[PDB]
Amino acid sequence: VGAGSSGGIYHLISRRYGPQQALKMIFATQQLALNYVRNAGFTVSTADMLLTPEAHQEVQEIINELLLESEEINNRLLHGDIMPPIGLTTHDFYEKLQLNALKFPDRILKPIMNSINPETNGLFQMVATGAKGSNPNMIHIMAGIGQIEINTQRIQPQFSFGRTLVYYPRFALEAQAYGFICNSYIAGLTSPEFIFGEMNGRFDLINKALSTSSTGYANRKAIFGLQS
Amino acid sequence: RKEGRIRKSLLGSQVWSISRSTICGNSDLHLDEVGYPISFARTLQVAETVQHYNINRLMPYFLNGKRQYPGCSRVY
Amino acid sequence: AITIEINSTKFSKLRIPWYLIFRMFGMTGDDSIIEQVVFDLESNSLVNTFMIEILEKSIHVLDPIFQPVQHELNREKIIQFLSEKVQYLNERQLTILDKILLPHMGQTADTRVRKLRFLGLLIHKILLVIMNVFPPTDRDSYRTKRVHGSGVSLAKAFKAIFNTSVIAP
Amino acid sequence: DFDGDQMNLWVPWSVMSRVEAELLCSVRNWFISTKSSGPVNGQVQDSTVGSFLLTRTNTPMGKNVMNKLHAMGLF
Amino acid sequence: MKICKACSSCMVRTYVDGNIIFRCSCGESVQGDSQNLLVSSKVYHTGEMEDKYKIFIKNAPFDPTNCQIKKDCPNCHLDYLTQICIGSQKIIILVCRCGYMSNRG
Amino acid sequence: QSLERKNLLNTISALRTVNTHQTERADMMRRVHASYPGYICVAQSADTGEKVGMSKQLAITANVCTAGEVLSLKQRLLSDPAIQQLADVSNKDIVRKGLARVFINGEWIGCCTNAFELAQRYRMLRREGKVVHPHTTIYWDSMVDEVEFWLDVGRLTRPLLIVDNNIEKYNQACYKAAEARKKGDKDWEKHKIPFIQNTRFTPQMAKDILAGTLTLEDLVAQGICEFITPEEAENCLVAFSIIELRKHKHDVTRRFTHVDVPQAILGLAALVSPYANCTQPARVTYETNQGRQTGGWYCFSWPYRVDMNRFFQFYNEMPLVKTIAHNYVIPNGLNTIVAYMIYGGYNQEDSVIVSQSFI
Amino acid sequence: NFTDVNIERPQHRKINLLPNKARLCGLSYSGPVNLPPFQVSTFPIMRGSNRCHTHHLSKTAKKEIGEDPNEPGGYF
Amino acid sequence: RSVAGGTNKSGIVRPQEIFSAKPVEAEQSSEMLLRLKNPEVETNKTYAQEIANSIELITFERLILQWHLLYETYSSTKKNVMYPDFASDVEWMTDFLENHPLLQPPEDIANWCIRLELNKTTMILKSISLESIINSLRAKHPNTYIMHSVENTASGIPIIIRIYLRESAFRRSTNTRMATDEKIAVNVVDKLLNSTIRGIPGIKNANVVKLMRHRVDAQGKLVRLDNIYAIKTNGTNIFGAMLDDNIDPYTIVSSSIGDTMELYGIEAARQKIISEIRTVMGDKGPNHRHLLMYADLMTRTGQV
Amino acid sequence: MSSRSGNKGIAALALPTSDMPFTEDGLQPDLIVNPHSHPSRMTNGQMIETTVGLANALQGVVTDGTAFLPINVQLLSERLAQEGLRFNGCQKMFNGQTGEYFDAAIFIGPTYHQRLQKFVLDDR
Amino acid sequence: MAMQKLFTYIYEFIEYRKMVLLEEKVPYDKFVQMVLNTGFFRINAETLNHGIVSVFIFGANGKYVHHGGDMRTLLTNTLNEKKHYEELILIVDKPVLSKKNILDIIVEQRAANPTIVINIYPYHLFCINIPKVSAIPKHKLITQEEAQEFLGREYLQPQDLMQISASDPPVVWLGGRPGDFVQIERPSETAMHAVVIRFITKSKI
Ligand SMILES: [Mg+2]
Ligand SMILES: [Zn+2]
Ligand SMILES: [Zn+2]
C-alpha cells in the first residue's frame, strides 16, 4: 500500500481499472486504516527507545569489541606491523583498516530486538512497516552512533597539525579522536561526540543546498537542448 | 540574465486570477480534491457565458451577488 | 620568478621582482639577498639547497616588464624606473615605498634592514609551503580570523567619509 | 509536506482552459510516474502503519477481530 | 653556489662547449671545476621527514598537546614518552625531554 | 542589518551573529570547522538556502577582545633579558643557535633561546595578571619555533578552567626511583608517586558564583581560569568535561592544560533546546533557527513603540524542563500538553491537531 | 590639523533627544562632534553606550523615558 | 561515493562529462572493462592477475631511484673529465664496453649525459629485467647511446644506466633555436622519463574483477556465471587493448563516450551515452526511454 | 508551531473540547503530534522532555534539562513510575468523538511549544 | 602491435567489402619489411563492378607521412595508372590525421581527380573486425530505391534523417559513400531491438 511501490495493490488497480479507481481506492483504504487506529491507537514513547539493563550491557560489550579491534590495529602501528598493499600508503591502509574494524556488526540488532516488543513498540512498527525511519536510525537512537564518516573517511585532523579537536592530543590513536561515537542518542552524546555529529550533520545540510543549485543549472540546459 | 526580458518577462509571466496559501492535511478530502477556503473562492471567479441552457443555473449566482455565497461579482 | 605586488593607489598591477625590492632597500649583493631568504648559505640539508636553486632560477628569469634593471646594481636606476612605472625624486619614491611596504614594521628609514629580513622570512615561508614542508594556510580556521563590529567597522567608514566630506571640499 | 509549505492555486475561468484542466491535467493522469513508470501515490505514515495494524493476524489483545458495529464503523 | 666576486651576483651557467663557463653581468667569467657538471638532478621520495620535522621533533617533549604513551625512557627512566606519528608512512617516533629520540624512520 | 524584534532571543542572537562576506571553497567555509568549538556555536546556522554556514553565532562563553596595550607588552618584551633584538642576531645566528622568532601583533621583534620557556613564563605572568593582560594571546608554534603575542582587536576569547599537574614532583620521584633501582634496592618502585591533575575550581566556588559573591574576574585573578583564543587554543589540551578530567585524574599520558564545560560549545539559541545532545545535531541547528522566530514579549516597551510586523504574545510560560539559556532570555511559548498519537490522520507530514478550546 | 574632539549625547532642537523620541519621530539618534572649537557634523550613537542617554539609567529610570528596561541595546 | 584520485566521481563531475560531451583527456574517471580471450582461462584468477600486471602502463621514471643530467661525454679513448661522485662508474663502464663490443660509443655523441639509478625493488616487484628496460629505451630513442651495469649482482651494488645524448637530437631545434642545448637536454629527459617500458598507454591501473555473466549451455539453458574474471582498468585506451592479444578485442567496454565514438562509431557512442547516464541515475533512475531521448538527441548529427 | 527540538508543524485541525481524546483522568492534549514525526528526524530530546515534564508537573517543580547534563532515561522513567504514572508516560485514553478507549496506551504529557511568527494571514 | 593487427584485418576488410584481391598475399615478415623499406604497402582489390580499390598502408616513420612532396608524388603517380580506380584508401597513424600539410595534399589531389574517391583513415579502423565488435550494431547499406520508398512513405527528405559520417568505422567497412543510406539494427532495452536509417554525410578529415 505504500507510495511509490511498483507492483503494489494501487498500481494493479490502476492497470486493470484505471488511475482514477486507484486514487479512489487509496482514499478508501486510507479511511479504513485511519478508522482502525481510531480504536487501535498508535503512539511512540520515550520507553520505546530504551534498552533493558541487560541489553545495554550487551551493546557495551559489542562496542568494547570494536574498540579493542581498533586498539590492536594501533598496536600494529606502534610496532610497524602495518604493511600497506600495492596502491595504498601506510596512512591510507591504516585509515581503511580502522574504518572496517569500527563498523557495527549485524548482531547489534540482537540487544535492540531483545528490548523491543515488536507487536507493541510504535517505534519499531513505524520502522518495520516502512512508514517512517530505518534500521540505522533505530540503532543510533538505542545502541550507538558508531563511526562518523565524511566522504567515506574518518574525521581528518583539521584543527591543527595532527589534531582533530582541542579535546584530543596530537597524533591521538584512540578511535574516539576521529569520529567514533560510542554513545547512542538516548544515552546522550558527549561534547566531542556531539561536535563530530555536527560536522557530519552540517555536511548533509551543505550537500542538500549545493546539489539543488548545481542540478538546477544542469536542468535548464537539459530543457533547452531537448525541448524542441 | 535571469531578470532580463527573455527569462523573466517572456519565458515566465506574472498572472492574474491566482491565489497562494499554506497547505495543510485533510484526511477527509479525496486525492483529487483540494480544500479551497471560501474567502479565496469569492475572490477568484469563473467566467460563465449566459445561454438558454445555463440561464436558470446562473440566476442564483446572479441574485446572490456579493452578499451571499455562491455569489458573483461582475457582469460583462 | 618571485614577483612582489604592493596594493596601493600608486603601486598597483605591478609585480616587482623580489631582488629588486631588496636592492632598492640597500645591500645590493645577491648573496646576502639569498641569505635573507635561506638564513644560512654555508648550510647542508636538502630544503636549503632547494631554496637556493629556487631563488637562483627566480633571479635569472627574464621579467618582460623589468628587463632593463634585472641586472642593474645602480640602486638609483632601480628607484627611477620604479618611479616612472608608478635625488629629491629619488628619495620621494623610496620614501613613499617604505610607508606602503610593511608599515607594521615601521615607516622610517631606520627599519629597512628589519623590513628586508621580514620579507625574506615571508618568502622563506612561501617556499616552505611550495616544498610540501607545510600545508597551505587554512582559510576557515579561526586562528587566522578576526571579528569586527561597530567600533572598527564605523571608524574605517568614518575615516573614509571624513576626508571626502570635510577635507576634500 | 505540511511544515510550512506554500502552493499556488488558480481556478481556470475560461471554458477552453476548464475543459483542458478536467480532461488533460487532472491528477489522475499523474498517478503513474512519467519518470519511473511506477505509481506515485499510496499510503504514507499513519495509513501505512494503520494498514499493518488493521491487517495483522494478532494483536496483544488476542486475535485481530472486531465486532459488526466496529466493522461497519470502519466504512 | 658561484657568486661573482666583483659584484656579488649569481653567474649563469652557459655550458660552452666541452666545459662550464660561469658568466656574470660584469662580463666576469670563472669557468668551472669538475663539480660544476651537475646540470640537473632528482631524488625520488628519499631522505626527508626527520629533517623536515626537525624543529617539531625537538619541541615534541615540551608540547603539552602531544600524545604520550606508557613506556620507560631508556636514557632518563621516565615511564611516559612522547609519541609522534608523522608522514603518510605513519612513522612512530618516541621522544623524551632528556633528549632520547628513538630515531626509527 | 535591520534589527528584527521577533523576541529577546532574536535580538541577542542578531547581535551575536558573525557574518562572512558551487566550488570546494563554498563547501569548506560553510562546514563546522574544528577550530569552532567554544567560540562558534557548532549548531547555529541557517538550515535552508545559501545562508547555511554563512551565519555564525558566538558560543555561550565566547567574547570578542578589545585592542590591548601593545606598547606596554612590547617594551616589556624588548627589555626582557631572555629576548635578543633583531639588531643583535643575524639570520645565520638564528638558524645556527636555535633561536625562535618572537612576534607581537605579527611584528617580529627579537629572538629567544627557548620558545617554550618564553611562552610559559609569559603565560604565568598573564595568569598572575598585572604585567601581562589576561586577554593577551600567547601562541607558541612548536612546528616552526616561533612565539606570537597577539593583542589586536577582534580576537575571539573564551574562559577556560586551568588544569594543574604534579608533573614536576612526578618527574623527580621517577628519577629517585630510577636511581634507587640503579643503586640496587629491591623496593625502588615505592619511590614513585601517583600523578595527580585537577582544576582548582571547587564546589564552594560554584556556590559563590550562584550566590553572586564570586565573579569571573575573581576567578581569573585567582588563577583558576584564563582566557583562551583559537590561536592559543591550538596550544591547549582541553578536557571536554570535569568527568573526563576526573577519569584521567592519575593518567600521566593524558595531561590536560584546561578543562571545559560542555555547554560552552553551544550558543544561546542552541542551548534553548533541552537534551540537545540526545537529539540529532541537525535538529539542534533547526532549533537555533526556529527559536529566534517565535512570538512573545518581543519588547517590554511595545505600547510606547510604533512597530511593524511585531507580534506580542500575551501569555508566556517557563518551560517545565528549562535550560541554562532561559536564565538570560525570557521564555516565549507554552507548556502545551501534547499527545503523540494518530488521531484521524489530520497530523500527518508534520501537521498538528490543536485544541480549539486551547486557542 | 584638528586637535579638539568631543562627541556629545544626542540633542534635539537644544534638548536631550531620547531614543524613543528618535524612533517615533523618525530622527537619527546621533550626537554632535566638535572639531576656535566648531561643529558641523552628527554621528549615530549606539543605544546603551556611554554616549547614550540611557547609559546610567536604572530599570525604573529606563521605564520612565519609554525604553525597554530589559533589552541590552546595542543598535542604531 | 569515493573521492580518491584517479576517478573523480564526486558531485556532478561525471554527469557534466557526459552532458557537455567532454573529450577523453578532459575525463577524470575513465575506466575500461577488458575480457580475457577465450572462456576457459577466464575463471583462472591467477591468470587474470598476470594479464592485469602486463597491461598496466609502466613508465621509465617508475623504475628509477634518482637521475642526474650530467655535463660529460664518453669516448673510451680519453679521460672524459667525469663527475667526481660518478667517476666510480668507470669501473663498470669499461666492463660494459668489453661486454658489448657491438655498441661502441659513436663519434656524433654529445657531452650531455643522464645518469640514472634503477629501483631493483620495483623491478622485481613488477618482474621487469634490465635488458627489457634497455631494449625499450633503445627502440624508442634512436638518437641516444645507452650504457649500463650488470643486473645479476645482489643488494648494495645499484643498477646504473647512463643515456648519452647524440648531436642528432640537438640539430632538430634549429626551428626553435631560442631554446639552448640545455633546454633540449632537459626536454629529452622528460621524454626519456616518460617512455613506456611495459603496458598499454593510458592504463594507470588494472585490477581483476569478478563478473556476472550469462551463457547458453549445451542443453540450451541460460545460466548465470559468477566465476568469470576480467580486468577493470583506470584510464581508457580501446585501441591499446585492441592490439593486446590477451584481451578479447570484441568485448572491450570503456566508460568514455569520446573513445567509443572515435573507435566504434556514432551508434556505439549513442549506446555508451545511454549506459553512462544510467550509471549516474542510480537504481532509482528514470524509464529507459528518457535515456534514449538524451542519447538520440546528442547523436542525431553523426557526432556527439 | 514548533517545539524546542526544532520540529516545526502547521496547525491543521481545531477540535472542540468534546472532540479531543482524553485520558482516564480527563487529561486531554492541546496539540496532537504524529508519532511519525519522531523516527526519521530523531528528535529524542522532545520525548525525554515530555517524560521529565510529566513528573515535573506532578512534583510541582521546574528542572534543568540543559544539553550535556548527565541523562539517564531509565531513571527518568523510574521517576515517572514513582510519581504514580506508568514506566512510560503512556495512559489509558479515550476517543473524544466516540468515547471508545484506544487499545494502546497513549504517550501524553507537557512539551514546551512555541508559535513561529509565520502567520497564515500574512502568507496567504 | 598495430602492424600485425592491421596486416591480418585489412584482408578481412577487403573480403567484407566483397572485393577480390588482384595480387597475392605476402607473409607478414615481407609486409613489415616492405613497409619499413618503401614506406608504404599497397594492396589492390577489385570490386563487383570491376573497379579497382587500392589500399596504402603507411608506416609511422615513413617519408610520406612526414613530407607532403612525397605524398603528392605517390598519389599523382598511382592516380595516373591505367586502372578504373573506384576508390583510394590510405591508412596512416592517427597523429598523421592532425598534420595539416598531409591533409592539404589529400584534399588537393581529391579535387584534382573528382571521380576517384580518396580516403585517409587511422590504423584503428582496420586493427579489428569492426562489424564483429559487440558494441557496434549491425549496419547495412540500403539501395536508393528502398530509401526512396521509405522516405516517400514517411514524407521525409534525406536531410531530415539522422546523420552518419562516411568515416564512421562501420560505414567505412561497409563502403558507404556520402549521400547513401545505412540501415542500423540497434539493440533496444525497451523494444528488444530497433531499426533506424541514417543518412551518410561527408567524411571527416
Ligand atoms: Mg516542507
Ligand atoms: Zn658580477
Ligand atoms: Zn628521557
PDB file of N, CA and C and ligand atoms in Angstrom, chain E residues 73-78 81 96-100, ligand 3:
ATOM      1  N   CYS E  73      61.669   5.474  29.536  1.00  0.00           N
ATOM      2  CA  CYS E  73      62.733   6.081  28.752  1.00  0.00           C
ATOM      3  C   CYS E  73      64.046   5.376  29.063  1.00  0.00           C
ATOM      4  N   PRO E  74      64.711   4.771  28.080  1.00  0.00           N
ATOM      5  CA  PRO E  74      65.962   4.061  28.381  1.00  0.00           C
ATOM      6  C   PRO E  74      67.074   4.968  28.866  1.00  0.00           C
ATOM      7  N   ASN E  75      66.985   6.273  28.616  1.00  0.00           N
ATOM      8  CA  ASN E  75      68.055   7.193  28.976  1.00  0.00           C
ATOM      9  C   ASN E  75      67.860   7.815  30.353  1.00  0.00           C
ATOM     10  N   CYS E  76      66.668   8.344  30.637  1.00  0.00           N
ATOM     11  CA  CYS E  76      66.408   9.013  31.901  1.00  0.00           C
ATOM     12  C   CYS E  76      65.337   8.328  32.737  1.00  0.00           C
ATOM     13  N   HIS E  77      64.730   7.252  32.237  1.00  0.00           N
ATOM     14  CA  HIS E  77      63.822   6.409  33.014  1.00  0.00           C
ATOM     15  C   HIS E  77      62.576   7.167  33.463  1.00  0.00           C
ATOM     16  N   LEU E  78      61.881   7.778  32.510  1.00  0.00           N
ATOM     17  CA  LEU E  78      60.519   8.230  32.737  1.00  0.00           C
ATOM     18  C   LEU E  78      59.560   7.206  32.150  1.00  0.00           C
ATOM     19  N   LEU E  81      56.590   8.547  27.561  1.00  0.00           N
ATOM     20  CA  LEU E  81      57.357   9.026  26.426  1.00  0.00           C
ATOM     21  C   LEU E  81      56.399   9.685  25.447  1.00  0.00           C
ATOM     22  N   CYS E  96      61.819  12.117  24.372  1.00  0.00           N
ATOM     23  CA  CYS E  96      61.802  12.463  25.781  1.00  0.00           C
ATOM     24  C   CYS E  96      62.459  13.817  25.976  1.00  0.00           C
ATOM     25  N   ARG E  97      62.163  14.434  27.121  1.00  0.00           N
ATOM     26  CA  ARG E  97      62.720  15.747  27.421  1.00  0.00           C
ATOM     27  C   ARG E  97      64.235  15.695  27.522  1.00  0.00           C
ATOM     28  N   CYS E  98      64.773  14.614  28.089  1.00  0.00           N
ATOM     29  CA  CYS E  98      66.213  14.470  28.248  1.00  0.00           C
ATOM     30  C   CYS E  98      66.960  14.501  26.923  1.00  0.00           C
ATOM     31  N   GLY E  99      66.307  14.150  25.823  1.00  0.00           N
ATOM     32  CA  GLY E  99      66.935  14.123  24.520  1.00  0.00           C
ATOM     33  C   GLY E  99      66.792  12.813  23.785  1.00  0.00           C
ATOM     34  N   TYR E 100      66.301  11.762  24.434  1.00  0.00           N
ATOM     35  CA  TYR E 100      66.077  10.499  23.750  1.00  0.00           C
ATOM     36  C   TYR E 100      65.117  10.706  22.591  1.00  0.00           C
TER      37      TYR E 100
HETATM   38 ZN    ZN K   3      64.234  10.575  28.994  1.00  0.00          ZN
END
